[PDB]
Ligand binder design. Structure first.
Ligand SMILES: [Zn+2]
Lengths: 277, 49
């Protein structure tokens, strides 16, 4: 697909940041190496459900004033194409497949089959969690349902699973045409307190490490590489300075389009014609 | 002359807050005596400026 690393990072960082900040022992583990007073002051101010201060995330160049006490500024950077395929063919498909998804589901009995229901039509099934079927189990997929023989499996009549699958758009042939790009985004934790900037740096590094395992950047946005700048005053001529430490996140990812092929051939036919010269 | 021409102001005197971290040297961000500024202020004084 076409991709937007900045909007991915914003969407991914915001919930993760919230869920760490609402959970005191995570911060208590992340900041174990800092000075005791720095740790306790940060945990008192920003952390837990009762926290009176708050962190914020957003893109650069807003028209309004931000929470300069603690704010992650996201800042889309450079990139370049790095590797190309022969014919620019990144892949080919017989059935137009959408995004990868993971969904929780439960088995139910139906007509002496077990079935799992999924919210969308299954374009491909990658994994039913914790199950490997035998041929006897007569595994079949149909529409948005996975179906599974009941006879030997009655103990599992309400078994709970996670389905990893991917959507289908439509039944069509085509070529995925495109290339790989290596692209940079900068993130900086702004604070007018230097110890807050240093803690926001630690929290962001933890978040990015945790992010490396996510399906989003396992399937796309691969090879996350991190670089770190000096701590410096970002703005120097207010009533106080604003400090930050930049980090650069670099990703390798595919830019591509679905070139559908309308041509289809369903019968050869043969004829002999005679040359009398 | 100054009392005629100046506006009434409240003046409060700066001092460094004793909440500064004894190692890092930076203010505690949760300090109630100073709201994350390194500088605490004495009670206000009425003056004209
Ligand atoms: Zn203080």
């Amino acid at each position: 697909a076409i991709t937007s690393v900045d909007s991915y990072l914003l969407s991914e960082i915001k919930p993760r940041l919230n869920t760490v900040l609402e959970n005191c022992y995570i911060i208590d583990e992340v900041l174990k190496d800092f000075d005791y007073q720095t740790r306790e002051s940060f945990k008192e101010a920003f952390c837990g459900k009762n926290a009176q201060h708050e962190v914020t995330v957003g893109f650069n160049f807003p028209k309004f004033k931000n929470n300069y006490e603690a704010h992650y500024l996201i800042q889309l950077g450079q990139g370049q194409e790095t590797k190309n395929s022969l014919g620019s063919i990144q892949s080919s498909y017989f059935e137009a497949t959408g995004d990868t998804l993971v969904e929780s589901s439960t088995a139910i009995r139906e007509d002496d089959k077990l079935v799992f229901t999924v919210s969308k039509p299954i374009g491909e099934l990658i994994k039913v969690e914790d199950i490997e079927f035998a041929k006897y189990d007569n595994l079949q997929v149909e529409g948005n349902k996975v179906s599974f023989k009941y006879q030997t499996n009655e103990d599992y009549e309400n078994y709970n699973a996670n389905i990893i699958f991917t959507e289908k758009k439509n039944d069509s042939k085509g070529l995925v045409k495109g290339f790989t790009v290596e692209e940079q985004v900068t993130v900086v934790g702004l604070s007018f307190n230097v110890d807050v900037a240093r803690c926001l740096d630690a929290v962001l590094k933890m978040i990015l490490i945790s992010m490396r395992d996510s399906i989003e950047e396992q399937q796309t946005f691969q090879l996350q590489n991190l670089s770190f700048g000096d701590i410096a005053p970002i703005i120097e001529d207010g009533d106080s300075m604003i400090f930050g430490r930049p980090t650069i996140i670099k990703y390798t990812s595919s830019l591509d389009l679905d070139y559908t092929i309308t041509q289809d051939i369903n019968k050869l036919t043969f004829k002999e014609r005679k040359d009398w010269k | 002359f100054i009392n005629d021409r100046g506006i009434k102001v409240l003046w409060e005197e700066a001092y460094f807050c004793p909440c500064l971290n004894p190692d890092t040297g930076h203010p505690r961000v949760d300090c109630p005596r100073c709201h994350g500024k390194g500088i605490a202020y004495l009670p206000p004084k009425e003056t004209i400026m």
